[PDB]
Design a protein around this nucleic acid. Structure first.
Length: 43
DNA sequence: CGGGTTTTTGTCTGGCTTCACACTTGATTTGCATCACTGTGTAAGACAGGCCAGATCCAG
């Protein structure tokens, strides 16, 4: 159901970067980082 | 006016679930306001007025 898109793959691939490089915070900071990274780069 | 005898329950007690709860952003899906119109209103009766007809009256 609900076939994902390029952004969902971006999330599922680049969230573990911040989840393993800085595990001291919850994935709220990881989402915030991934979002400020996507907004600064292209698609 | 209040003594017996079961119901009706929140806990004490601490330790096992299954759901609850921060963030995105780009869609995707619902929810709701807006606009020019609609149908149901739906057959007879009362009254004045012109018109001849025939009754009402006049005079040789």
């Amino acid at each position: 159901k609900r076939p994902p898109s390029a952004f969902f793959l971006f999330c599922s691939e680049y969230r573990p970067k911040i989840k393993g490089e800085h595990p001291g915070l919850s994935i709220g900071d990881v989402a915030k980082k991934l979002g400020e990274m996507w907004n600064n780069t292209a698609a």
